[PDB]
Structure 1
Amino acid sequence: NECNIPGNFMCSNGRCIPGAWQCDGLPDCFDKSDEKEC
């Protein structure tokens, strides 16, 4: 959905990570939601 803090990307499980952690070659989400469509 939407993270409360503006500059964040939301994982599959609802955990918000920074937007510069999406598609970086390092796993951060459970089951790699930042590592799917890069």
Structure 2
Amino acid sequence: AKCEPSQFQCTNGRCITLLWKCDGDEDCVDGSDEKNCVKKTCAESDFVCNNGQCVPSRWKCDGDPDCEDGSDESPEQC
């Protein structure tokens, strides 16, 4: 049944907000992220950041961020 978050009553009987489900952190005890959302596994036209976030490879150093963690301006080269 719908409850506190109006989200999904997860398998262990916890009203978990689906806003966190597709985040990589198992919010419920079982399930949640186990019902894995689309990790696209991008080709090398994209670089991959510390979060595994894909971004256009020509922006691996340019002085302005593209990933949430900013790894596309990492001192590993820039």
Structure (1 or 2) with the larger CA radius of gyration = 2
| Deviation (angstroms), 1:9 | 0.1
> Percent identity among equivalent residues?
50
| Deviation (angstroms), 1:10 | 0.3
| Cα deviations by residue, 1:2-26 (Å, 9 ceiling, x for unpaired) | x532311001111100101110111
Match of 2:69 in 1: 31
Q: Which stretches in structure 2 are left out of the alignment for 5+ residues?
A: 1-40
Counterpart residue identity of residue 9, structure 1 = F
Count of aligned pairs: 36
Q: CA RMSD in A?
A: 1.5
The 1-side partners of 2:74 and 2:44 are apart by 22
SS in 2 for 1:34: helix
* More helix as a share of residues: 2
If asked which structure has higher relative contact order (CA below 8 Å, sep 6+), I would say 1
Q: Which stretches in structure 1 are left out of the alignment for 5+ residues?
A: none
